[PDB]
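Technical appendix A lists one of the benchmark inputs used to test multi-chain prediction within the project. The record comprises two sequence entries:
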Amino acid sequence: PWEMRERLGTGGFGNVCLYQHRELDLKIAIKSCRLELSTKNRERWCHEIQIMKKLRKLLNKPENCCGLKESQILSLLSDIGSGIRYLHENKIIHRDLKPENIVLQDVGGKIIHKIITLQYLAPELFENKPYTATVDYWSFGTMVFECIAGYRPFLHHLQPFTWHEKIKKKDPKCIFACEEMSGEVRFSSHLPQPNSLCSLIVEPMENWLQLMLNWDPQQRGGPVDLTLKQPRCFVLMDHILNLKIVHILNMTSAKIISFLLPPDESLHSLQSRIERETGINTGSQELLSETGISLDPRKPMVYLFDKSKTVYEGPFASRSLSDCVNYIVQDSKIQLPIIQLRKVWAEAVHYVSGLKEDYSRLFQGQRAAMLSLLRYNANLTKMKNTLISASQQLKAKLEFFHKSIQLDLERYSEQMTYGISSEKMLKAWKEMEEKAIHGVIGYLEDQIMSLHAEIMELQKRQGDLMESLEQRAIDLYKQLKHRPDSTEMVKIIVHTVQSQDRVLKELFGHLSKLLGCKQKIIDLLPKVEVALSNIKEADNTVMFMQGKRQKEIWHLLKIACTQ
Amino acid sequence: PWEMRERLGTGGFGNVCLYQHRELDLKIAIKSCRLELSTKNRERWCHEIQIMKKLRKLLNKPENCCGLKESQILSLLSDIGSGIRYLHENKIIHRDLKPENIVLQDVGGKIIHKIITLQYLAPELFENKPYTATVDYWSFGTMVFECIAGYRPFLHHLQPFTWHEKIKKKDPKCIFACEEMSGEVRFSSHLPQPNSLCSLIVEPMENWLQLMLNWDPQQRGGPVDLTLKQPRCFVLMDHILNLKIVHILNMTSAKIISFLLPPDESLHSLQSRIERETGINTGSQELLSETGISLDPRKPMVYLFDKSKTVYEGPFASRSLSDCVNYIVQDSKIQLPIIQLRKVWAEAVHYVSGLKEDYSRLFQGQRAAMLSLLRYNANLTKMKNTLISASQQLKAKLEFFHKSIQLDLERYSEQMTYGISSEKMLKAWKEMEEKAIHGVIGYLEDQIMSLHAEIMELQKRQGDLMESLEQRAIDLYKQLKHRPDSTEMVKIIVHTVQSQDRVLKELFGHLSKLLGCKQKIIDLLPKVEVALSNIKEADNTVMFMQGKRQKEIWHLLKIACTQ
């Protein structure tokens, strides 16, 4: 019993449909071709199905109008790369490239992607009837930059006909194209500013796209690697996919640097790399995990603190607005053609989203600092429990020491009668008495639980309020986006900059209190080490002095055997 | 510089006025008599001022329409009693009695009261020109029942003329008067039901008012006590003022009983009084203070728990509605004359206020139970700290016991050579070894901190929501009160009864968890006593066994002196 539900779309000579089982969640797309076909087209569809048996919603999101997040673009490169190489191994050229061919499928947080409009049709497909797999490189890299910037790499916002008439008139050794308001065709051989990708990836992706967006058909793939039978863009993509890039969120200056690393980097070698590269001393390189764990350098988002500097100044915002957006900050009432307005507003929304991520990640590392504080706390609890244990045990040892030497003093005083006693033993036991004489236990305990209660007081956010502010702004961008003055948006910029400044300065006060707690702990540690060491040493001396007293008793047994 | 502010009222031949200093809070009432008086009236006012140099807002509150709280009436009796006797000692009859003569003055929570409308003018003042101090007794006791019920003791809601025409036609040996809807004059020699005063006070206040509201002028004060020159009502009022009445809020049945007590009652004698009177066993008489302290019976709102019974059934509401109010619960749309409606609605508001006080005081004793739980907790913490202290000290004593007897075993084994050793000492030291052999320490510790964390979980109110419901109801009574259907009020009765039932049953679950915690603690206590006792005893045995070993060493010194 298959339920004839709503369609999944329009496909073939009919509709792509959703046929779920009536009881279970068993969905499949069935490409309806019930319409009477010619036998070349019917049989054509037959071997189409036979060979088949052998994302566009994400392309139109409000939150990535200037393009997608880095890691998501990476996963699209590896997944759609495996699909495209999977089709080229199967001696199959798809040629029907579009974001609608790609399935969304959550597997535990991971979206999986397989392959199932004149902007994707190749210019040699605009001209000639036969084709090669180069159209997959042109349309695919085209769609890749449609993930990178959110829109078309060549002359976007035009109709595709005159668009390809300028593609075949474009210098193919360039990357990005745009058109100004004065009618100038200005095109760039480099990627634009609105990007989230690290430059270490960008420039091999730049020249990679110089091979990809080369509209000359014979040079779309690469100078072919004759050792692995492989075009150059595949080699560059597998090169990029195995880049080991870490990220150290430079907290004290509100920065982050990506680090392209060799695969044999020990963490100590990376400590030297940061000490020479960033100039931050390894005696103060405080490196916390996403869970706030300090590393082991014996192993091969990282959070960067200065162990020395407790003073935390203001954040160092190295991201400005573009001068279009700052022009609208200065003058919001100018009613331009609304395409450039949604461009400017989009840049503003991506900026304020950057601010949201700033409070997000700084907030995150603040929490990780608190978790490391908890780990130091548990260390302190262990050390103080062992400390007062051995302390009080040592006190009882002193107790039976004093009673024992009191009894020994009695027996010595009685055997004094016959002149048996030797005074060097007595003065030795007096020395043992002064050593038995030999508070800050409980006082430094009060330092411990005082700091403990202080931390718990520090335990007692506003970027959700700024999420309502930015959320209002992106709602403005949506309600102005579906349409065929910007003052209030600049006011949201005001409230987000100033509110962000307030809560960042308060959290910097929190962090200063945290490092004060941490330095107080690290000051408390060798107190516990020296104190515990004196406890164990003094213990073992008193125990050996009891054994030495038993050697004196033993010597009295020698005196008993002497007579 | 005195500021001529607004008046304080109208008085004399002008206005009672507020003349504050312009800088300080120095207020005084000045009785303006600027109007041209005759010299008997001007000089009359002169000796009035000369003798003077030698509350009505509270009478009209929305919350006490059926009369005032008990303790406040008590304080008015002692304060206005001291004022009236203060005036009768000064050979002065005021005769101008009204609630406007009484000053409100907060002193740390206490209102102080001193003395400065035809319903207060006496019937002999309605008839004759000369008078005595009996008019103070009539008008004063009149105003007293105007505190007790909130309105006039004789035929209220009438005009004062025909009112006194029925006062002089009333049987003066009765107390309360009313008039029915059919024109019947029905008057009562007892106090009505809408009262908060305890009956132990009510009936001497009943007969006290039978002397007070006796409109026969010669019998208003009393059969005069010839030993203290004192009318009977003064003797009865000082008798009532020195009554020592405590209150035990019977929590398990949702009750409270006042207890008139002799002044020499020990708390153990009162435990017998509760065990025979209430039938609640002194082995289960759990008596907690307002701070939740269990008493010392060696000393002379009390909270009553059953130590045995952990099952807490539903509350036992012995306060019903009157059948007028229940009639309006059954039929709310009857538009009566609105005087009886505000009477019925007023009874409803006082009922729901009683419910508010029920949740208030049960909530209060619940909190006191939690405070007593905290006291037991601190006791447990002390006992466990001392316990693990003496435990681990005992462990170190066993340690040097075993090393000591190991060394003694060595010396004994070496002096075995010459046949010096005596095997009874050896077998004795083996017995000492098994005694040295002679977990639930830390296990019952886990019981302790397990229960501690469980209590802290129980630590994590709705009568404020019912305060909004009742507050809505008294707002209905005010908005219908200022006017010259009751269904929604009965719906508030529904929500307050059912919501009150829900939160009371939840809090009864809380209390069951509390007594479970308490019985768990009291089970944990003799474990600590027996365990600690075994620790101290076993300690003192091992220490004496070391001293006995020193007596054996002493005996070896006797063996050394033997040769």
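Residues 147 and 366 of chain B are 32 Å apart (CA to CA). The domain at 1-54 of chain B is CATH 3.30.200.20 (Phosphorylase Kinase; domain 1). Comparable benchmark entries are summarised in Table A2.
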